[PDB]
Amino acid sequence: GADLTPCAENPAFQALAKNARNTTADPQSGQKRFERYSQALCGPEGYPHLIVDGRLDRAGDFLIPSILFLYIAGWIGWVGRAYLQAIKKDSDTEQKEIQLDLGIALPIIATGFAWPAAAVKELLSGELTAKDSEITVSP
């Protein structure tokens, strides 16, 4: 909290709420917007402010979006990492990169929901990191 008030009681917020300019086709989209934003904290200007402190009182701001991202993003990286590794054993690696082998990819895309488990498994004992001595380097 710094130079702010609750959004529900702030006058400048209520001033903007009367003229909300509904976004979607729904007529009440404007009033429905300002209703939910009353929970957040607002400043003198009348717009809401988010606090990414990490306090559980206000976690929907950044913390819940933060967790939802990393589960989605690690899905993409684990899938890409596994699809790239599976191709390397095959003969024609470069063509499969451009012309995707969907038979190999979609089973991998079916997985990835449990990417944190496989990540920890490779970290504890496996292939998450190659040795520095066996990687190309400049002089």
Ligand X SMILES: CC1=C(/C=C/C(C)=C\C=C/C(C)=C\C=C\C=C(C)\C=C\C=C(C)\C=C\C2=C(C)CCCC2(C)C)C(C)(C)CCC1
Residue from 6, 9, 11, 26 in contact with another protein (CB under 8 A): 26
Picked from ligand X, ligand CLA, another protein, none, the partner binding residue 83 (CB below 5 to 8 A depending on kind) is ligand CLA
Choose the stretch contacting another protein; rule: CB under 8 A; options: 1-9, 11-19, 53-61, 110-118: 53-61
Name the nearest CA neighbour of 8 among 49, 53, 35, 38: 38
Judged on CB neighbours under 10 Å (0-12, 13-18, 19+), 115 is buried
The two tokens of residue 74 are 């690690």
* Beta bridge pairs of residue 6: 41
Residue 72 as a binder of ligand X (CB under 6 A): the answer is no
How far apart CA 122 and CA 114 sit, in angstroms, is 13
Please report, as ranges, the residues that interact with ligand X according to CB under 6 A. Answer: 52, 54, 74, 77-78, 81, 119
Please report, as ranges, the residues that interact with ligand CLA according to CB under 6 A. Answer: 53-54, 76-77, 79-81, 83-84
